[PDB]
């Protein structure tokens, strides 16, 4: 399961953290709600409120984010969207 | 296509508006990104920034919202999540 980054507006590092915190979440948790919950909680930890996470295969979105704090990427089959709107 | 409301924390009226603005979006637009885009733009219009919309069939989420400004519902087959985190 390699990551594709589809759209980012994110600190290159932060981008990695995210990609990391996702691979982990996907070990821990099988249900999407959990996975997204893991990664949200993480980032509110590492970086401040207020992050929102979406995970699935089948969805689109229209959303507003703080500059530099948005990322959207596959982890093989599964799509992860993560942003702060604080 | 009847609506099921799964979770709300929303002005009963607002709840309706949302449900309405969704049935419309689903006439207009076929791609999910558009649909969600329609409804987001709407609510930022009617009620202020800053709303985020997700639409699909297959996804879960972990997200933080302003009190009274969250709703999550099916429109038959298709799932709509809408909240302000302003």
């Amino acid at each position: 399961r390699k990551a594709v980054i589809k759209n980012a507006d994110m600190s290159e590092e932060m981008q990695q953290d995210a990609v990391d915190c996702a691979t982990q979440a996907l070990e821990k948790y099988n249900i999407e709600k959990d996975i997204a919950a893991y990664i949200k909680k993480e980032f509110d930890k590492k970086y401040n409120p207020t992050w929102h996470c979406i995970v699935g295969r089948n969805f689109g979105s229209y959303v507003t984010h703080e500059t530099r704090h948005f990322i959207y990427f596959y982890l093989g089959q599964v799509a992860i969207l993560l942003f702060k709107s604080g | 296509r009847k609506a099921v409301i799964k979770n709300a924390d929303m002005s009963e009226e607002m709840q309706q508006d949302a449900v309405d603005c969704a049935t419309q979006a689903l006439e207009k637009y076929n791609i999910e990104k558009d649909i969600a885009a329609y409804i987001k733009k709407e609510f930022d219009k009617k009620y202020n920034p800053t709303w985020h919309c997700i639409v699909g069939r297959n996804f879960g989420s972990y997200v933080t919202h302003e009190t009274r400004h969250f709703i999550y519902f099916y429109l038959g087959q298709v799932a709509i999540l809408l909240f302000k985190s302003g």
């Binding site: 979105s61 959303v63 507003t64 942003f83 | 791609i31 999910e32 987001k40």
Partner: peptide
């Protein structure tokens, strides 16, 4: 600043048949 973004997903097209 803030920016607004779409994200649709490419639900991996059904294998030819």
């Amino acid at each position: 600043l803030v920016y607004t973004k779409q994200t649709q997903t490419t639900p991996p097209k059904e294998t030819l048949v």
